Amino acid sequence: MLIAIEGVDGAGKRTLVEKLSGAFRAAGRSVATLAFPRYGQSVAADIAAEALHGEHGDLASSVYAMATLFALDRAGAVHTIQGLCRGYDVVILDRYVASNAAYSAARLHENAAGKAAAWVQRIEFARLGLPKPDWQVLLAVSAELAGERSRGRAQRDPGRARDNYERDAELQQRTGAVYAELAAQGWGGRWLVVGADVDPGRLAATLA
Amino acid sequence: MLIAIEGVDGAGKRTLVEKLSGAFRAAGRSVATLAFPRYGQSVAADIAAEALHGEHGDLASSVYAMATLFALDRAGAVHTIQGLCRGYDVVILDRYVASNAAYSAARLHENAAGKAAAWVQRIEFARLGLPKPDWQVLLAVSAELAGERSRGRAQRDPGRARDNYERDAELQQRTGAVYAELAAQGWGGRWLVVGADVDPGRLAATLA
Ligand SMILES: Cc1cn([C@H]2C[C@H](O)[C@@H](COP(=O)(O)OP(=O)(O)O)O2)c(=O)[nH]c1=O
Ligand SMILES: Cc1cn([C@H]2C[C@H](O)[C@@H](COP(=O)(O)OP(=O)(O)O)O2)c(=O)[nH]c1=O
Ligand SMILES: [Mg+2]
Ligand SMILES: [Mg+2]
């Protein structure tokens, strides 16, 4: 079973992945996890992050260039994802294809039924062959709270300074809205919308 | 021995690669060839070409995004290039790293001592580990003649319509100028500047 955890920056995805993995293991299922971007394992991922931190000229100014880099990162992980799914009962991803649809649409002020989301579908699922997730869990959080979390992280960790997207409050808001739309239409597969107070035990029961 | 053939669009590079390979083989040396972009073998290469033909939103509008895609294409060919060099006496490339420096600098109206060329050096040779060529041969041709060749190709081949770069006469001119500068400074290694009337036999003798 392939599960992807989605949400804006500072929504609490990493923590949910930890809690969910614990819940699945408590139920006797083997679990494997993978997070995108795969910094260090993909040149595309590293360049993307660096661009969001002010490097690489005009790269970050292009919505499709950034989306392409994240897609190329996932493209290189197809084998890994396929291998993990045939080796573990559950594979949980911290961000997946929907992140690209949500952020790209939001940067262009488009909705989930727009051009960017459709492009992501065509490129990542059809062309690159990335498997569609059995479940996509949207960790919906107030834009204000998520932004506060991102800022707090930068304050206590010199290695966690915010990037161009995280510093854009309006972008984060629009991204949360597109995510809600993607979930409602079942973009890429079935979705579940949860809050910061979701019970890991029952969530795992719903997914497993 | 690693040799890269460089020059603007329609300079006659493909033909020179053929003639040069023939000359080397006539001298008893084994020869292998590779052309960049590696269309069909790299998702990055294909997306780059498609972007230059009007697809993928705002991707082509970013100079660094395009350069990154071509660099990612070559990155995936490192093993191949290394394998070919230890298996053949001569390895000839139709375009290599210098193409990225020349076109990127030209799109930004920079010279060979500019920011873009230095970025290409840092990213492709140092970071990605691409081997520096023993020789880089610049097939210098009049901007007018090269442009005429590109146009003629599109006229007789429906599968060879010109792209965004080829349609930009001024860009092609500036690119030729940056190439001349790169050769004069020995950017990335030793260069040889030849014309359309260069003798394949003697050129091979100089290189081999
Ligand atoms: C994985 C992914 C991330 N992004 C965005 C969301 C984030 O702002 C940013 C990087 O992802 P994120 O997981 O936030 O990484 P970091 O720890 O570096 O903050 O890029 C996309 O636009 N598309 C994608 O496919
Ligand atoms: C290989 C390469 C090409 N280019 C440019 C030169 C050409 O205009 C274009 C594509 O290369 P080209 O060899 O002309 O391919 P095609 O047969 O599709 O015309 O992109 C770069 O800017 N950087 C690179 O590294
Ligand atoms: Mg982030
Ligand atoms: Mg061309």
From Swiss-Prot, chains A, B:
ATP binds at G7, V8, D9, G10, A11, G12, K13, R14. Pfam families: Thymidylate_kin. Coiled coil: none annotated. Keywords: ATP-binding, Kinase, Magnesium, Metal-binding, Nucleotide biosynthesis, Nucleotide-binding, Transferase. CDD domains: TMPK. Its cofactor is Mg(2+). HAMAP family: Thymidylate_kinase. This is Thymidylate kinase. It comes from Mycobacterium tuberculosis (strain CDC 1551 / Oshkosh).
